[PDB]
């Protein structure tokens, strides 16, 4: 069917939907299911037992937040079906899923059962004309408009580094670590309890993510800022109460660059970028260092590019040019890539038709992926 | 060398005594009776000005070191037991009081969970700490606390005391002694915390899982006609002499259920062990599960350990925990001292080790030089 | 063992010989760890359908005065020995001595060295 | 009285010369704890080694000191040798002379620094380094024939005819047990079961050793794996959790025979064994086909010998008879050779003494290596 394809980013934190024609995603809402915290027997309470996106944000304190997708993998599929149904609601897009074809953006090196079940839902529950699963990293390059480039895509659920040179992705050089934005939000909650402010509730976890997003700066030297006495910058909560964050502000997102501090066995965001380049062939190393692209929401931390440049330089070889080319629209970069890809006439060949999936089998989605 | 003193500053009660003893010498409510104030102010209070906190701790430590313990503070060392993720400014103040005013030789800031493990003798064990403020859990594997897989919920003494006060005010039946033989509701606007605590301990008990699960659905009244078990007999409690409060049988076995209630989120005192254990490393699972430790005075409540261990094994079969923690054998450790004084006993056992104490502990000469207490946060 | 290890490590750092092997390098006490019970004793069925006398059960205050084995029942609760009191002596930061009390403070209101702001 | 100490990348096999099997066999690893700023409990060792670190895997970060038969961290290797002599063997290194094993075509600094430690740190009376492949022949009572000694670190092919080695015919391949273990993690992550940490990698090695087997026809085995669930076997982890690895069982050891899977762009363990024989003189080829030995624990895969024979026979001429020599004790084939060599009265002269080391230096080893 010729009618405009619907791009949808499967972001663990925030799913971004919209049409391929639009330069930006019109409808982007948080990826969580909202049910009433108190188990509702009586009338005059929150009805439906389902609150998604803007409806949830309004009555947030009353509801109990449950993320359906963890570490770029779908844990509860029933929840994810309701989320994708809300994408084709009167609230967002307001269209038939049966008419328009779909593009998914699954993280690299995900389970094959995750891709197979994702297709089954979108072909059976929704009567889609055609579906195409793609890598988040490959899209990010289409948006910026360069063929060569390493893509350090720090999402909410997963942070992954994929090196692609002249439209060729080395699949062995891909590096994936689970320590992402959501873990930084979890570790900030621990440090906030060490400052003396508890956020025990699942609703109260959402305002820790807001505190992180508002006020958390990455110091170039962490040891000097610790010895220096903090200003203790006040943050205002939804109720109106003030909280002085203090040293927790800067030593929370540090755990990205040094995850051994809390006690998580991972490489680190500076390390995975360098290791991904060093794993690739010697001839390409210089060009891959010379073309690095930051993607996702967990790069927007104040002074992230400043710290990463410094942490990469000392690990990388001496007298090598390191350009970390961040776009202005890092959060919405992954979708814009899909929107451009979808618009091209080549995409018509790439996607798998509904009749193709019935005849060919299950492999059809996997083999056409690349 | 002299036998080092052990102090354990809590919101409800403080444990005090000397190292290498069977239990604590003095255990008292963590308050101070200041002139003018009718009700005594609580000594540990998080999120206040440092100068006001300094004065309260100076007043309290003085009472511990002279009226309760009889020993010179400057002469012998200190082993300060405090829970992990204790507020930064509070711990900084407590040390600054001991080092500046009292001029103690050296303080050792031991985490309560690692101390509780020493008392049993086992090197690795899961430790739940159901205290006053928050019921915290922290897996300890072969001497190393795993901060990565922490867990805390506000389902302790404070949350239970508040729940009791609410229920009593609804079904309020007091005999004032002024033509008040007939049921008189809410004669007093608020009930003092000292009374509520005494009612909780004597009257209220923890129900069986089978009876408790019925009580949860009963008070909910989820499309059912009077589906509650038969309650215990109503106990009459004296308030301030003449006033006799008749405590309803339902309140006794329903007040506790707020701890073990699911409340949609799936966040109980029971769930917190399994939520933490599932997040732990794959190799450590079977060792931690087999070695459970239940400290804190909230777990002293009669029939708490049976309900918890039962509620665990029920929540195991639930589909979320069924995959990972399905075929696991959960066995509880019985510590030598009572559930309240497990934390203290560890510090005393550690305090008896004079050789290791001096090395690990922070000396006054170091603090006066630097002015930087070591913590699990960055240096 | 840790003291000997820490001492051996510290004198090796102080020596600064880079762990030079001049000589050859390198009875045990084993406690049995407490056995974990499969099922803890349940709450007795007496507690259900029995009048609770507040005289028989003990309050928190009198429970906690006997901390070594704080008993719920009154019949278990034994009388503890009477707590000894203290005779304070004050010493300043800059000054050395200030005031003190006799060796027979029992049944005496005499100060060995009387010093107070009202007396100067 | 003499000591044989195999310095394998996977496992360190140590024992007394003359004995049938090695006394102490432990995994060659150093376990440093994921420590926070929180104080540690009692009975605390700063760095654990071997069977102790294998017991306390959960918390300790496992770091293999030898990578591809090259000692990367010498301070770590020193702590293993200290655990080998003093604790494991219960013997003084000053009394007994120590035979060590190095893989062929290793860096010269490796052999140089190895002996320097043995002479200075441990103060051994004599030290001789030997090629692992040269020892492995003595195990089978064969002077003539090639060996395919595939270890955890490296795999090497050393052709030796009538007690004379062909040095130029020796070929080294970096593909080995640890690369297969790393490969098995990736394909298990594709199935669903994610293994990231260093402790988890050790559990994946236990899965590999027990289940994984070499297929005769890979394409035929993949067809049976797709149709029927007969090849699918269950394994219990340290946790009660059980996993069904499926087709990935026989997919892991395939990487040996076709490195393209791992993405090395090199010849297979079958093809390198053929290439090594062709590099040798035309006359002696006959005996090398007739006496092809498989050594190390990477040749203890069920049915590698059958697959090896098939692949060599196809490449080799039709008239030639290809017999693969697979003794029951392949894992201890390097050590048992060392025990036979050290015991022989002829070898008494070949030892490098302290006096010889003191006068000449550490460079003497390169002359009296092989
Ligand atoms: N029965 C088995 N089946 C399959 N793989 C095995 C088996 N036993 C061991 N392995 C794998 O092969 C490796 C064999 O290591 P081994 O014990 O031979 O020591 P090594 O370090 O390779 O020594 P060397 O290089 O001297 O042979 C192990 O690390 C493991 O990954
Ligand atoms: N301005 C910001 N500053 C700091 N962190 C941010 C900011 N915006 C988003 N984040 C973090 O990044 C997350 C968004 O990740 P996102 O880019 O949507 O991932 P994905 O690429 O998988 O869609 C948020 O949940 C939050 O943790
Ligand atoms: N022996 C007991 N029996 C029953 N309940 C008790 C007992 N001792 C204490 N409690 C209750 O449990 C709580 C235990 O708190 P505690 O652990 O002493 O304080 P903290 O957590 O601040 O160290 C008290 O506030 C009290 O309500
Ligand atoms: Zn003076």
Swiss-Prot record, chain A:
<dbReference type="GO" id="GO:0005938">
    <property type="term" value="C:cell cortex"/>
</dbReference>
<comment type="function">
    <text>Part of the ACTR1A/ACTB filament around which the dynactin complex is built. The dynactin multiprotein complex activates the molecular motor dynein for ultra-processive transport along microtubules.</text>
</comment>
<dbReference type="InterPro" id="IPR004000">
    <property type="entry name" value="Actin"/>
</dbReference>
<keyword id="KW-0963">Cytoplasm</keyword>
<dbReference type="GO" id="GO:0005869">
    <property type="term" value="C:dynactin complex"/>
</dbReference>
<dbReference type="Pfam" id="PF00022">
    <property type="entry name" value="Actin"/>
</dbReference>
<dbReference type="InterPro" id="IPR043129">
    <property type="entry name" value="ATPase_NBD"/>
</dbReference>
<protein>
    <recommendedName>
        <fullName>Alpha-centractin</fullName>
    </recommendedName>
</protein>
<dbReference type="InterPro" id="IPR020902">
    <property type="entry name" value="Actin/actin-like_CS"/>
</dbReference>
<comment type="subunit">
    <text>Part of the ACTR1A/ACTB filament around which the dynactin complex is built. The filament contains 8 copies of ACTR1A and 1 ACTB. Interacts with dynein and adapters such as BICD2. Interacts with BCCIP (isoform 2/alpha).</text>
</comment>
<dbReference type="GO" id="GO:0005524">
    <property type="term" value="F:ATP binding"/>
</dbReference>
<dbReference type="GO" id="GO:0005813">
    <property type="term" value="C:centrosome"/>
</dbReference>
Curated annotation (Swiss-Prot), chain B:
<keyword id="KW-0206">Cytoskeleton</keyword>
<dbReference type="GO" id="GO:0005869">
    <property type="term" value="C:dynactin complex"/>
</dbReference>
<comment type="subunit">
    <text>Subunit of dynactin, a multiprotein complex part of a tripartite complex with dynein and a adapter, such as BICDL1, BICD2 or HOOK3. The dynactin complex is built around ACTR1A/ACTB filament and consists of an actin-related filament composed of a shoulder domain, a pointed end and a barbed end. Its length is defined by its flexible shoulder domain. The soulder is composed of 2 DCTN1 subunits, 4 DCTN2 and 2 DCTN3. The 4 DCNT2 (via N-terminus) bind the ACTR1A filament and act as molecular rulers to determine the length. The pointed end is important for binding dynein-dynactin cargo adapters.</text>
</comment>
<dbReference type="InterPro" id="IPR004000">
    <property type="entry name" value="Actin"/>
</dbReference>
<dbReference type="GO" id="GO:1904115">
    <property type="term" value="C:axon cytoplasm"/>
</dbReference>
<dbReference type="InterPro" id="IPR043129">
    <property type="entry name" value="ATPase_NBD"/>
</dbReference>
<comment type="similarity">
    <text>Belongs to the actin family.</text>
</comment>
<dbReference type="GO" id="GO:0098958">
    <property type="term" value="P:retrograde axonal transport of mitochondrion"/>
</dbReference>
<comment type="function">
    <text>Part of the dynactin complex that activates the molecular motor dynein for ultra-processive transport along microtubules.</text>
</comment>
<keyword id="KW-0963">Cytoplasm</keyword>
<dbReference type="Pfam" id="PF00022">
    <property type="entry name" value="Actin"/>
</dbReference>
<protein>
    <recommendedName>
        <fullName>Actin-related protein 10</fullName>
    </recommendedName>
</protein>
UniProtKB/Swiss-Prot annotation, chain C:
<comment type="similarity">
    <text>Belongs to the dynactin subunit 4 family.</text>
</comment>
<comment type="subunit">
    <text>Subunit of dynactin, a multiprotein complex part of a tripartite complex with dynein and a adapter, such as BICDL1, BICD2 or HOOK3. The dynactin complex is built around ACTR1A/ACTB filament and consists of an actin-related filament composed of a shoulder domain, a pointed end and a barbed end. Its length is defined by its flexible shoulder domain. The soulder is composed of 2 DCTN1 subunits, 4 DCTN2 and 2 DCTN3. The 4 DCNT2 (via N-terminus) bind the ACTR1A filament and act as molecular rulers to determine the length. The pointed end is important for binding dynein-dynactin cargo adapters.</text>
</comment>
<feature type="cross-link" description="Glycyl lysine isopeptide (Lys-Gly) (interchain with G-Cter in SUMO2)">
    <location>
        <position position="30"/>
    </location>
</feature>
<protein>
    <recommendedName>
        <fullName>Dynactin subunit 4</fullName>
    </recommendedName>
</protein>
<comment type="function">
    <text>Part of the dynactin complex that activates the molecular motor dynein for ultra-processive transport along microtubules. Together with dynein is involved in spindle assembly and cytokinesis.</text>
</comment>
From Swiss-Prot, chain D:
<dbReference type="GO" id="GO:0019894">
    <property type="term" value="F:kinesin binding"/>
</dbReference>
<dbReference type="GO" id="GO:0030863">
    <property type="term" value="C:cortical cytoskeleton"/>
</dbReference>
<dbReference type="GO" id="GO:0016887">
    <property type="term" value="F:ATP hydrolysis activity"/>
</dbReference>
<keyword id="KW-0963">Cytoplasm</keyword>
<keyword id="KW-0558">Oxidation</keyword>
<feature type="modified residue" description="Methionine (R)-sulfoxide">
    <location>
        <position position="39"/>
    </location>
</feature>
<dbReference type="GO" id="GO:0035267">
    <property type="term" value="C:NuA4 histone acetyltransferase complex"/>
</dbReference>
<keyword id="KW-0539">Nucleus</keyword>
<dbReference type="InterPro" id="IPR043129">
    <property type="entry name" value="ATPase_NBD"/>
</dbReference>
<dbReference type="GO" id="GO:0050998">
    <property type="term" value="F:nitric-oxide synthase binding"/>
</dbReference>
<dbReference type="GO" id="GO:0005737">
    <property type="term" value="C:cytoplasm"/>
</dbReference>
<protein>
    <recommendedName>
        <fullName>Actin, cytoplasmic 1</fullName>
        <ecNumber>3.6.4.-</ecNumber>
    </recommendedName>
</protein>
